[PDB]
Amino acid sequence: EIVDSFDDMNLSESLLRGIYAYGFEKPSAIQQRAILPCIKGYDVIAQAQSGTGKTATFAISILQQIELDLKATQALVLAPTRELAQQIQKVVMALGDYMGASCHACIGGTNVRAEVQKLQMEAPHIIVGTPGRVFDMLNRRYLSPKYIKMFVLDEADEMLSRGFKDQIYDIFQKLNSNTQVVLLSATMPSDVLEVTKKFMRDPIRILVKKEELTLEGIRQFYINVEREEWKLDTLCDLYETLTITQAVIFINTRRKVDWLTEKMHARDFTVSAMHGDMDQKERDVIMREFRSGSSRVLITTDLLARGIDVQQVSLVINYDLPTNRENYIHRIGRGGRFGRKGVAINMVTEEDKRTLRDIETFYNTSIEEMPLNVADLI
RNA sequence: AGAGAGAGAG
Ligand SMILES: CC(/C=C/C(C)=C/[C@@H]1Cc2nc(cs2)CC[C@@H](N)CC(=O)O[C@@H](C)C/C(C)=C/C=C\C(=O)O1)=C\CN(C)C
Ligand SMILES: Nc1ncnc2c1ncn2[C@@H]1O[C@H](COP(=O)(O)OP(=O)(O)NP(=O)(O)O)[C@@H](O)[C@H]1O
Ligand SMILES: [Mg+2]
């Protein structure tokens, strides 16, 4: 089970070079437990706290099984969002820089002809895309499941929810029977575990209790607002505290993201907006300016709630509370990346305080009011 | 379930 370091995993001398070149030194908790089962060909259900290195878990696992001499698609990874797919693609190529393993992003909003040309020319060893463009190319027979022996679902609970389930099944129907299935997500509701019995041959169940998901490095607070109409002013009074680093402001609707943005712009406050109705060129720019520190504050929807990794981010503001119990975990997970110190602030009204109790009792975590010395905790 | 949030091409 346990492994001391990457060297003790029987990885190629060229793979261990790309791992340490990326910045790693010692495998995280889950990495020591799941990287070997995944390479051994077992169906794995890996659950771990946020920011613990689940992306590199399967990325290392995939890169080991890839018979680089075979120039065909051998692994398929699916993400609920495009931004996450692009992020996952870079992590794979990074860990396999000295290997020559080709990893292609098969996401929406990209140039179709360019992708069709790249696939017909060369077959990437690893596909990391979203269900839409992935199932499209499979239908056009530009992607071949013939040699796909590994099928990974990041944020599995979201990928197996009401909206994505039928999409995953349309893709799964085109895969072989012997295809290995790997599931990863910080959350794994019981209802989602009931459907894994439908398409997984008794996998390795690495699960975690809900009372232990709350990270210790993420401090959770709340602010009494009473009425919705005062949330704006409260956010502005926090502005100079937000710009202390990089902050993510979560809003439950696209329409409200644009409303708040135009309201803060009208007050001479630098904030960026991000949601799914924007053109893919806008989303790529906005996300670029955010990672490069150009923009410090970002007002977004649940699009960026899951998996988005920005180490510079150390503050998460919940302008609205999530309508999904599990989504709260992923939201706060954007700060305090891998042991770092992170802060989460929940703007709660009176009618919303009812909801906050459920979160505390569900995950067994107390969320105390914010002090004035919080600028030093960021 | 839907809504919300996401999730091909055009
Ligand atoms: C991003 C977005 C919208 C994304 C969609 C809509 C992404 C979808 C996801 C999937 N659904 C399914 C699988 S995969 C299940 C239904 C499936 N049977 C559809 C089908 O096979 O029809 C054929 C005929 C056409 C075809 C091969 C489609 C391939 C992919 C596809 O349908 O993409 C909208 C943005 N808003 C702002 C407008
Ligand atoms: N062995 C390692 N040592 C140190 N840092 C690491 C290691 N592996 C990964 N990381 C970093 O830790 C962070 C974790 O990111 P990620 O792999 O996305 O975890 P995650 O669990 O998938 N996040 P989430 O989707 O919200 O659960 C990233 O900044 C990685 O670069
Ligand atoms: Mg992740």
Distance CA A89, CA A82 (A): 11
Of A211, A233, A265, the residue that ends a domain is: A211
Tell me which protein residue sits closest to nucleotide B1, measuring alpha carbon to C1'.
A162
A201 shares a domain with A224: no
Q: Which residues line ligand 2 (CB under 6 A)?
A: A 24-28, 31, 48, 50-56, 186, 307, 309, 311, 330, 333, 337-338
A277 shares a domain with A251: yes
Beta strands A272-274 and A297-300 are parallel
Three-state DSSP class for A367?
coil
Angle, alpha carbons A129-A134-A135 (nearest 5°): 150
A173 shares a domain with A239: no
CA-nearest of A149, A178, A148 to A73 is A148
Of A166, A195, A211, the residue that ends a domain is: A211
CB atoms within 10 A of CB A303: 20
Tell me which protein residue sits closest to nucleotide B9, measuring alpha carbon to C1'.
A136
A191 shares a domain with A78: yes
The ligand 2 atom at the shortest distance from the C-alpha of residue A55 is 17
Experimental method: X-ray
Q: What are phi and psi of A187, to 5 degrees?
A: -120, 150
Of A211, A244, A271, the residue that ends a domain is: A211
Cβ contacts of A317 within 8 Å, gap of 6 or more? A235, A238, A242, A247, A248, A249, A250, A344, A345, A347
CA-nearest of A157, A205, A48, A147 to A168 is A157
A218 shares a domain with A205: no
A216 shares a domain with A202: no
Cβ contacts of A332 within 8 Å, gap of 6 or more? A50, A215, A218, A220, A316, A318, A342, A344
Distance CA A366, CA A43 (A): 36
Q: Which positions on strand B lie below 7 Å from a protein C-beta?
A: 1-10
Distance CA A74, CA A70 (A): 9
| Domain assignment present for A285 | yes
**Atom 26 of ligand 1 has which residue's CA nearest to it?**
A136
A180 shares a domain with A128: yes
Note the residue count of chain A. 378
Distance CA A310, CA A11 (A): 28
Q: Write the DSSP symbol of residue A186.
A: S
| Domain assignment present for A86 | yes
Give me the half-sphere count of Cα atoms (radius 13 Å) on the Cβ side of residue A160: 24
Residue A181: both structure tokens together: 């299935």
Q: Are A124 and A101 in contact (CB under 8 A)?
A: no
- In three state form, how does the secondary structure of A120-154 look? HHCCCCEEEECHHHHHHHHHCCCCCCCCCCEEEEE
| Domain assignment present for A64 | yes
Distance CA A326, CA A306 (A): 10
Which nucleotide's C1' is closest to A135 (Cα)? B8
Q: Are A368 and A88 in contact (CB under 8 A)?
A: no
A234 shares a domain with A207: no
Mutate to test the pocket of ligand 2, among A49, A58, A62, A337 (most ligand atoms within 8 A of CB): A337
Three-state DSSP class for A369?
strand
**3-state helix vs strand vs coil in chain A, percent to 5:** 45, 15, 40
Which nucleotide's C1' is closest to A276 (Cα)? B6
Q: In what order do the strands lie in the sheet with A180-184?
A: A103-106, A126-129, A75-78, A150-154, A180-184, A44-46, A204-206
Q: Are A251 and A302 in contact (CB under 8 A)?
A: no
User: Which residue's structure tokens are 């439950």?
Assistant: A252
| Domain assignment present for A1 | no
Cβ contacts of A69 within 8 Å, gap of 6 or more? none
Question: From start to end of chain A, where are the E strands?
Answer: 44-46, 75-78, 103-106, 126-129, 150-154, 180-184, 204-206, 218-226, 246-250, 272-274, 297-300, 313-318, 342-349, 368-369
| Domain assignment present for A70 | yes
DSSP assignment string, A252-271? S-HHHHHHHHHHHHTTT---
A271 shares a domain with A207: no
Q: How far is the CA of A122 from the C1' of B3 (A)?
A: 42
Distance CA A215, CA A195 (A): 27
Footprint of strand B on the protein (CB under 7 A): A 80-83, 107-110, 112, 129-134, 136, 139, 161-164, 167, 252-255, 275-277, 301-303, 305, 323-324, 327
Distance CA A279, CA A147 (A): 34
Give the distance (Å) from ligand 2 centre to CA of residue A98.
Answer: 21
| Domain assignment present for A120 | yes
Q: What are phi and psi of A217, to 5 degrees?
A: -85, -5
A230 shares a domain with A198: no
Distance CA A295, CA A317 (A): 16
Alpha-carbon dihedral sign for residues A64, A69, A74, A80: positive
The ligand 1 atom at the shortest distance from the C-alpha of residue A166 is 15
Residue A172: both structure tokens together: 């799964």
A220 shares a domain with A77: no
- What per-residue string of b and e applies to A128-153 under the rule 16 or more CB within 10 Å gives b? bbbbebbbbbbeeebbebeebbbbbb
Q: Which residue type occupies A378?
A: I
CA A376 to chain centre: 27
- Residue A200 backbone zone (phi > 0: left; psi -120 to 50: alpha; other: beta): beta
| Domain assignment present for A133 | yes
Domain range enclosing A71: 6-211
- The domain total for chain A is 2
Distance CA A3, CA A225 (A): 48
Q: Which residue type occupies A333?
A: G
Three-state DSSP class for A220?
strand
Q: How far is the CA of A324 from the C1' of B3 (A)?
A: 13
Q: Which residue type occupies A192?
A: V
Give me the CATH number covering residue A89.
3.40.50.300
Q: Which residue type occupies A92?
A: V
Cβ contacts of A39 within 8 Å, gap of 6 or more? A9, A61, A64, A65
A293 shares a domain with A223: yes
